[PDB]
Amino acid sequence: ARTKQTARKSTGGKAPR
Amino acid sequence: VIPNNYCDFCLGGSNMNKKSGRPEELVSCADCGRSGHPTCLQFTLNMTEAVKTYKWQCIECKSCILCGTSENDDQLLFCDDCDRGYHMYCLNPPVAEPPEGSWSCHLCWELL
Amino acid sequence: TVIPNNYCDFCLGGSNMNKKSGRPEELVSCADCGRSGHPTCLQFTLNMTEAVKTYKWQCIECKSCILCGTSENDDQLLFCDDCDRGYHMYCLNPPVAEPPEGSWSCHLCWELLK
Ligand code: NA
Ligand SMILES: [Zn+2]
Ligand SMILES: [Zn+2]
Ligand SMILES: [Zn+2]
Ligand SMILES: [Zn+2]
Ligand SMILES: [Zn+2]
Ligand SMILES: [Zn+2]
Ligand SMILES: [Zn+2]
Ligand SMILES: [Zn+2]
Structure with missing residues (x-):
């Protein structure tokens, strides 16, 4: 199963706005 | 937007x-x-x-489809088929922890 | 039979x-x-x-590579994220040197969209 935390780890960080 | x-x-x-x-x-x-x-x-x-x-x-x-908040976002599952978010505690019945295997939501299951 | x-x-x-x-x-x-x-x-x-x-x-x-048909170099198989078929990285077109960082799906699954 996927959570917010596994999703963040899976994709790496997001650019700032 | x-x-x-x-x-x-x-x-x-x-x-x-x-x-x-x-x-x-x-x-x-x-x-x-x-x-x-x-x-x-x-x-x-x-x-x-x-x-x-x-x-x-x-x-x-991402906010839970069932209650509408993005709070307790450590408890959100993301459906493996459609990416919608659901709190483990908002599911009926509720789950204490993420399932070991893949997990998809009720809407995806009903399609099928 | 199997x-x-x-x-x-x-x-x-x-x-x-x-x-x-x-x-x-x-x-x-x-x-x-x-x-x-x-x-x-x-x-x-x-x-x-x-x-x-x-x-x-x-x-x-x-699992064998769909494209060449062998199960040699099984460490170089990529598995499609939509159908689970295996493909050697070196059999792809263009080939790749290493697995993608992102998700990846095969040509047959892309075709099924159309
Ligand atoms: Na894969
Ligand atoms: Zn947003
Ligand atoms: Zn909720
Ligand atoms: Zn779903
Ligand atoms: Zn089982
Ligand atoms: Zn087998
Ligand atoms: Zn091959
Ligand atoms: Zn495929
Ligand atoms: Zn990108």
Whole structure:
């Protein structure tokens, strides 16, 4: 199963706005 | 909400995914305009299709379909088939912890 | 032929009970060796489950590259994120030197969109 935390780890960080 | 024309993960536009070295489309959050290449988002083709059928939310805006909040976001499951978010405690019956195997939501199960 | 196993390799439950989820669930079975698994135990999505039922799906042990037909260099197989078919990185067009950072799906699955 996927959570917010596994999703963040899976994709790496997001650019700032 | 104007969609961003670059990918949050790789900073490439629709003409260049900087991780794959190929052009690739962008999908964008309905709430804040953050965008990403489907492959950078780790989406399957079928998930990419699915997120085009509803007001998809980025990882940061994602709110539980059942209660409407993005609070207790440690307790959110993201459906493996459509990316919708659900709190483990909002599911009926509730679960204490993420299932070991793949997990998809009731809406996806009913399609089938 | 090949006799499908009546139990899941990950939880030893039959179709009547997935012992992880505590619910009944269909088994899928390898076309070559008959070893079986609950799709959820296999980490398959609902849509992958439907795709693997449309062709002679092979388990991780039996996977051969679709393109060249061999199971040599099994460490270089990429597995499609939509259908679980295996493809040598060097058999792809263009070939690649290493696995993609992102997700990846095969040409046959892209065609099915059209
Ligand atoms: Na894969
Ligand atoms: Zn990207
Ligand atoms: Zn957003
Ligand atoms: Zn909720
Ligand atoms: Zn779903
Ligand atoms: Zn099982
Ligand atoms: Zn096998
Ligand atoms: Zn090959
Ligand atoms: Zn495929």
